Design a protein around this nucleic acid. Structure first.
Lengths: 157, 157
DNA sequence: TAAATTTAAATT
DNA sequence: TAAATTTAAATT
């Protein structure tokens, strides 16, 4: 039967489970940080006033790695995509990741595509839409699998 | 003081008045037609079920003419722009206008830019956004003037 | 330089 | 081939 999530951010975790199960993926790491205060910005905080968070997840599937970036938009402010970064370097990810967090706040909660294209090129700056209906916090058991399917599409170029 | 409109379509008429007054424009013609049934389409009718209408308005300002196209989206389905066509030919407008009505329904209430660019080129296929806040059917007396100002911008290239 | 709203190409 | 939803560049 269908799924019911507390927030948008909860659904992103159920996706990781499905990737582990149906799509044979391994989670390398999982870290969640707060978006930084950049300039006179206000969107680095949620409507209620708490720090807005972003979760990065390293993944491994069939001898190839990618990073998943997901922004906390559970307050309904903005509908961003799930970013799929291919070509990340352990030796500089922490710095690249920090620059990404800054750019997201600069562009008012919007992926810095100019930077991402700079970093990983047109074919390395990928992303996947959230499943229709998540605005209602309900997703069918098959829509959740399609979320994973559509992710493998971007990975398979 | 501010304006209150019954529907989105009512505001487009108040714009024409302001263009006559503050921006020295003359209304050449005013016709409103129903969008056609194209294929197995349903958007040529409003939510309540009545025929969806489109109003064309020929305008003259400082020895130069342009056509204004406005689609009836008072049922809240879609938020389209006000099209500003420059380079229209009396000898073929009726046919061009008909093709435009078809394309709008083909693309599911969306301006056929490919056609419009075909017809009037990049510099002749212009448009202007509706004033922020019209979703609430309330517009400030200065926002209505800005609607006309921003229209003259496109006309002045 | 920030956010907020309108628009439209995309996709699902 | 239609509509419906998600996304994002634009603009105001």
């Amino acid at each position: 039967y269908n799924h019911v999530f507390a927030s948008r951010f909860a659904a992103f975790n159920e996706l990781l489970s499905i990737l582990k199960t149906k799509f044979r993926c391994r989670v390398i790491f999982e870290e969640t940080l707060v978006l930084p205060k950049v300039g006179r910005s206000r969107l680095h905080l949620c409507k209620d006033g708490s720090p807005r968070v972003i979760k990065a997840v390293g993944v491994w599937r069939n001898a190839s790695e990618f990073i998943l970036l997901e922004v906390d938009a559970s307050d309904g402010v903005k509908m961003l995509s799930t970013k799929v970064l291919i070509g990340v370097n352990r030796e500089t990810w922490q710095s690249d990741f920090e620059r990404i967090r800054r750019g997201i706040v600069r562009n008012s909660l919007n992926w810095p595509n100019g930077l991402l294209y700079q970093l990983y090129g047109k074919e390395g700056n990928r992303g996947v839409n959230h499943p229709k209906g998540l605005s209602e916090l309900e997703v069918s058991r098959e829509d959740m699998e399609g979320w994973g399917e559509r992710l493998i599409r971007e990975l398979e170029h």
